Give the backbone structure.
Amino acid sequence: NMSFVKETVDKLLKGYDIRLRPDFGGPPVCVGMNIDIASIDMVSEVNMDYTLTMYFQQYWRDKRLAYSGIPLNLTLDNRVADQLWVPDTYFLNDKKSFVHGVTVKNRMIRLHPDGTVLYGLRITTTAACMMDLRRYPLDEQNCTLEIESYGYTTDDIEFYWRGGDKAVTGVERIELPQFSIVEHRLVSRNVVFATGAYPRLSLSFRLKRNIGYFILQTYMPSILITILSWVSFWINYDASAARVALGITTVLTMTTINTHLRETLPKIPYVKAIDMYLMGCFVFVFLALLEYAFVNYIFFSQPARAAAIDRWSRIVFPFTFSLFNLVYWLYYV
Amino acid sequence: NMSFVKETVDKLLKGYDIRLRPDFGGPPVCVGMNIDIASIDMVSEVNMDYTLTMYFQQYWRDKRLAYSGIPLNLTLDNRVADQLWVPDTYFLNDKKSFVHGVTVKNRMIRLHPDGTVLYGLRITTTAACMMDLRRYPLDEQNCTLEIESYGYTTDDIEFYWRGGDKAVTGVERIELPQFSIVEHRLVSRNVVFATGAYPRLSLSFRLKRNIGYFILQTYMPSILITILSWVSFWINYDASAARVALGITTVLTMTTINTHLRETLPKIPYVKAIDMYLMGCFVFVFLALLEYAFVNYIFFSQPARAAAIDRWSRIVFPFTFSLFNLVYWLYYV
Amino acid sequence: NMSFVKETVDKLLKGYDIRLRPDFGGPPVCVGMNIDIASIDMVSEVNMDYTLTMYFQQYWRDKRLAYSGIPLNLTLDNRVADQLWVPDTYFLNDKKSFVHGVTVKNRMIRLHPDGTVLYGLRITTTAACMMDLRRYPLDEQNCTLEIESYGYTTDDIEFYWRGGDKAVTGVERIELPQFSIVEHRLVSRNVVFATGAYPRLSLSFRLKRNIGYFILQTYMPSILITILSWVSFWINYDASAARVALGITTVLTMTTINTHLRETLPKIPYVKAIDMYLMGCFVFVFLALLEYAFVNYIFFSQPARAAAIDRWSRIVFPFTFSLFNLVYWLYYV
Amino acid sequence: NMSFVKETVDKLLKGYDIRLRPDFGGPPVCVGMNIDIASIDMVSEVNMDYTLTMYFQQYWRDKRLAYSGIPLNLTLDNRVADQLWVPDTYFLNDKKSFVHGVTVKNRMIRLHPDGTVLYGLRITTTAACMMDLRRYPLDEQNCTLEIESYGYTTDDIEFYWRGGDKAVTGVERIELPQFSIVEHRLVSRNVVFATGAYPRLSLSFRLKRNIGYFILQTYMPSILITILSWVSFWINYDASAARVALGITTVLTMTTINTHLRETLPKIPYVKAIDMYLMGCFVFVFLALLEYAFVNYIFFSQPARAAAIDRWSRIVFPFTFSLFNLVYWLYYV
Amino acid sequence: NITIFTRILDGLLDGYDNRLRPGLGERITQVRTDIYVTSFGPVSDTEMEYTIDVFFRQSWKDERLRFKGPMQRLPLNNLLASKIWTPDTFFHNGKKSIAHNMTTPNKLLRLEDDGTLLYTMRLTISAECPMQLEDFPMDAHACPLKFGSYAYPNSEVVYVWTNGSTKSVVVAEDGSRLNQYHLMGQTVGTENISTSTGEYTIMTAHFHLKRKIGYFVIQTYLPCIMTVILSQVSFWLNRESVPARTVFGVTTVLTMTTLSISARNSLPKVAYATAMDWFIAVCYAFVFSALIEFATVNYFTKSQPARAAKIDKMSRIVFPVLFGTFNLVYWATYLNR
Amino acid sequence: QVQLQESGGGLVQAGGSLRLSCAASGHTFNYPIMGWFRQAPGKEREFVGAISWSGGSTSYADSVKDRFTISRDNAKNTVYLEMNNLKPEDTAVYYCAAKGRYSGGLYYPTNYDYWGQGTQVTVSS
Amino acid sequence: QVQLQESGGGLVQAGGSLRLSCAASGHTFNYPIMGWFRQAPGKEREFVGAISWSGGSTSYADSVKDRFTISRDNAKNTVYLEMNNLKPEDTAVYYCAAKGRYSGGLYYPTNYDYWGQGTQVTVSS
Amino acid sequence: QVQLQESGGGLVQAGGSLRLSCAASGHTFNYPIMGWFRQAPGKEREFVGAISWSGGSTSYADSVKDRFTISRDNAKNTVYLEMNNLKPEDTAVYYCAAKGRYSGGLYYPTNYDYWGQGTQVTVS
């Protein structure tokens, strides 16, 4: 019947105060939460943040709201949320967030005869996380998400997850292009500020870099220019005016890689791991041009010394550079 | 007359509850929808999303609103929408949306004596869709659009299209520069979450790439540099100091195409189809410079071998490159 | 006196319904409009849109509002607009718009004893218009602006301009840097949707490109490189190792013009008119390098043929290129 | 009990005026503040501003709000803030700010039986600060933050910090990548405008540049090109056609550093300290090419003068450039 | 007591509409206006707009607020502004404006026994101004800031400056963050603009600006003249440097081109004959011209090297002269307009 | 100013198949969507089908589905009307027209601006 | 559109080991997640496992917490299911199935579209 | 997973000046801010001071304002407590600990995660 329900809700709201949390003098409230993740949009190493969109749910139990005469479990419109009590809940490591308001504001009110209240949301959050780029790009990032109450202390409100094998779903929906997902952890603390002890639930997960792309970008140029710096050893010195045309170009090419490839890179002050790598390949083409520099000063003394340099040459650069790889590719992995 | 109508509406709203959906205890409501598309703005492969603007319409049937004394079919102002019930409706694969509020908020209320209510909107939606770029740019994209209720389960609300040969119009108004429209499909599901089974209508359509532009951008450079790598075979070796000036330039030119043309490209980790193509043309100009590299080591042994290399040369590169086209342009189409 | 007016307005609003348009059962309303343009901000060929700011005015005639006792013609504050009826009016080809709210919301209410109501606004509108770039940049653009009602059909509402030699002013205030204004036209239609026939007034005006700038950008480079491709004919072949240094550079220079000048250009798939022009000047410097290519193959046969090539040369390129201008600069204008 | 508290709050708000500050005729109010800083996001030298996020707290003491019957210290919901008095407080050197509204608006109301009211906020602020870039990048920046009342003069309102060794916490949480934090100062003034004397509290702190990055960016290129400008002195003049190939390249390379490195730089009119440095290294490679310019004019006169130039050469450039360092690296530090 | 003011307040608010200006059928309302510029903002040359930050103030006299109270000066809450009447103010080139509401909306209400009202706002305006860049980068142009009364003709509302015509606009000391430009002077004025509705009243505040010239000399004009002298000293090189100056005179056009690239990097788009481009092209034409002085020799010095001693020796005292006479003509044109 | 041209029809008996085409002349940019009609001698004007500008999008009436096909090309900027399954009830002077870009419902006669006139198709058995 | 096929039946004693497989075909990009169940001899099916498209995450059910390890192959477009320490309560048919991208929770059989006819594995005492 | 170790303490008479060593091992980037502690034999434990991990800032208790100093390392990333002006009330075993990026105010002891076995430091 339509008749029972309208006067039933009005009995539940006549004299219902909105300014106070339930069980005010007595025991603290026991609020559980639940998160379903839709997707993670993008990760900016420039701004050290990321953007996701979740489904945010909450339980609590108010004795002020307890119908009796209806066996059904109710469902109301979102405009009743301005006439009820909700707990204050905010995100700690965020920078900008909002609630989707496409046709209405996406929030859900659901009731139960005991007083169990379900409160859904749909929030897009730009949350910031600090990054360590010492091992860039062979890195593992741990970007987190923390949830707090704001006004109430731990004497009034009690956060808890709804089971560690639960309450975080939608994991395999996450498709980052650049990264990959590893692990989940769930945290419950008691953080104490200058006012008082506050509860906190935290969400944390690893991020692993997909390595199989930057070889195409960074490494395969710097592989080949080492080999193009080795052309001169098989070049007989009759093109002594044209040997340097290689030796200028390769040193110039590393400068372009130092700069034009830098345009696709973030900006930190401390030294990245690829910077030591680009320091290493820059030194060899700097020394490969210093092959001919010692040629032209003592070639006039004797060519017999200059006849033996390419015996010295092509037995050093294809091993010091190869051992430079095994220092590089093993100190990290 | 003006006199009848004002007291008629007030009888329809005195005691009208806004918190409840019609036919609350009884059968579920039967809501139909209708979409007219104005235009699609832009498609970002960087952000994997697109932006359109639609006309969004809905039916339902409330017995609480049934005038009798007027033969006309009414039309009200949009401020009455805050005093009526609407169903919760949101878009699933969106990122940011809003309602146009230019002079008023663009929504329409229309009434009928039985209770048929028409509710129009005008929404610009930035909806995200995942892209596959294995066959870039000879690809077909299927970007979709899904519509759900939020609070109500399938026991209360029932979405349906108003005829499969209807309810999606404004097709030929769509003018993308880059893409082209192929096909329409209409979906009705029963998606089940952890709470309960929810209804869904989905809109989906193909996107086909207009191929006749990237030849001008990507291919016609890489066509000609293969031919400019063939100049040296007709060059007699008296310009042995000037042959390499071609051979340095073309290998350098492919590096510019690897980088400067990359500036107009998206960023995915897996290998695009043009990347295998740019790998292929890079190898030939790498081997065309390795023509002269084997010249200068055994020219001193005999020129008779070096007299036959351009007999070997110009009978291989104009066929291995031509067969490289027929592998490329047939494995895709 | 202050005393008469306050109770006069209250008689005009006691029992005034806001939900209904005036003369509801009877004849349709007869609403006139009026537009004064402040300025046009910018035109994006990238986004195919433009941004202006107008003064938007409306008339109508409500018999519900008719004071009698005051000879003056009234003027009210903008907060009374939330307690009156306005017609729904929106812009069709827009993408984002708003109303300026600097100190108050810029809208004006003016009354008259018969019932003539004046309603002013001040709207900045980003309206989209499709562009044709076949004749880029020697083009004429027709970007428009259309105005509709939203909820009411043609049985209720009647748009009309206030005289074709009127109702659009502020023409000569328009200062685009890039374009120029030509002509105005005023349209009154009856557009029919699936619901019913709706009225429409449309504003349209031409846009003519100011041609005297792109010569400095695009043409004067491509003029001179044709002449710098003619240096070699007066060069005697003793610098046969240095002739090609011109011939590499000019072909390389056109590639920079193909790319670096492309950075200041829009992106369409179909071929612009400057692209055929840049195709034409690219071919001549491609063939000017193919002068020396046929030199070095039959110079060893005879120099007598090579003595006559610059007799063949400088009698062809300064006429085929000059006739290439008269095909180009006459097929368009 | 629940019964006492609801009628207690209603006694505190029945007849409570919101339009007036407490102790209106009598002594001025004595408001204390408290700031906890979460993080500082980014510092734009382009826009001369920075972005932080704080916890903002306030005390005052209203005698209009004094409950007696409850020993507890209360805690209310944030919707009661629209029914109380708050002092006007704004930030002076800001450009855009907002209050986080993630699930609710993040503000806290806390009460005490005497009348002590605590009012928390959570504000992200983009505040502008002027920068001096004479000593760029070996600079110290003093970006500040100032807090004022707006409507009330010093006869009504009294700002004060809650102890100089207090009221600013969260210092060591600040992690800028580029900068470093040095010192804190706390200011209390009496600023007088044309209306009247207004109070102000100010927050100020130094910013020190992390120097160990721009050597990798700016200096190590300009170090090495000085050495590559010294190759020619050990080059015997038989490559007189190839010496200039170094001398063109290095002067060209400084032009790239003058421009391509400029792309990663801000824009001020006055001369930065690195600009004098890049002026200095540009002059030496300009004069190193003017070594060979005086070679080729008097080599034909005698080579005996040209035999002594590299005795003059490599005893000047490795000392004038080295003394150029000690002028540079000591005048700043 | 506080209670004494409330009955005086609420007994005053009874019967007061906020839909009517005072003296509606009666005499004309005058409005006093005060502007205090806090911190002037940056200017984008590409979009012809500028940021301004003001403490905008208004003042007028009401009759319907007079009383008899002890304090005689009343600081009040923001929310009374919704309950009382204010006039309106737009800006004729306001592209985007913000009235902040950070902890409160930045408004104030101040009252006297007269009914003299004080009503201030903290605006942040990105208004636009047309520019004539015909003498770039030697410009000195005025970007004004007009405003006037919306919705009221001459016969109802008149705007008057608060102080005298000098003291009514106050610029702050340090807030002028003119990196790129420089502030010159102020000029106020009042007008009557006739529009379609009715003739109105207009305020006007000009601002004369001037560009900091001491940047583009070392930014642009040195490696112009450096590349010029790179070509002009190169006349004193050996004629027998036969494969050498082949490579040399090429790149002197490339560097001249890449400089014009960076010259057109930061330059905003116009449709003008800009004096910088008017200086680039002459700088661009001389490595274009002095190339021919060398490029003639390949055709020439094997035929007859006798006349190479005639004109190429004259070439060392012509092209550095005529370029040097050009720069004296150039800077004489623009530094004194 | 955009003037159309209709040609290509005649008499075919029952069960046949006939092709008709429509030529365009004028400023064809702001009329991206061209369409067709039919006019029975006793009846009113009716809509049959229309075509996009890029050409990849079609729209057809329900009753006259499975007997015609529309395709366009920018050779002479002409549109084509294919053939199948003649039925003698379709004796009607056909018509070709186009529509402005923001000009509304694509099923209705009065929304179109420039009507071409031309060849009737008279069929019998 | 996407056709599926499994392999790998048999019978082992209790506590043994066994491996599964499932093949793919067609436009598999529109179906990121694949999963498995078991129609009991008397009852309906129950969830056991699911795998992301990139192969990162692998969610289980509560009884099959760290009992069975299930892996991924992008190259062969296969999924591999390592059963270890098998139970007599595991005699059922394991059906291969996929899910659309924006398609609901992980545990629900109504959600899935395509289905491969699984094998009947048994186990002895 | 941070493992710590203490060294530097012992038996020093009044007027002394010492240094202790919190041996930072394992990963470090998850726990930037570290600090020291003291504990009387009977009285409950309390706080002395903490440092920014980048070395940018220190903080101190009010009773030992301007008397203790705390080092910072980037090489081995371990910290030290160098000081002057001994006070005989400071007879306390000392400890080091660390916090996450969001774990509250610095003054409170239970907000920190890892703990080492401290050195007995006695005033004689």
Observations:
- Chain E touches chain C through 47 residues (CB under 8 Å).
- Residues 213-337 of chain E form one domain.
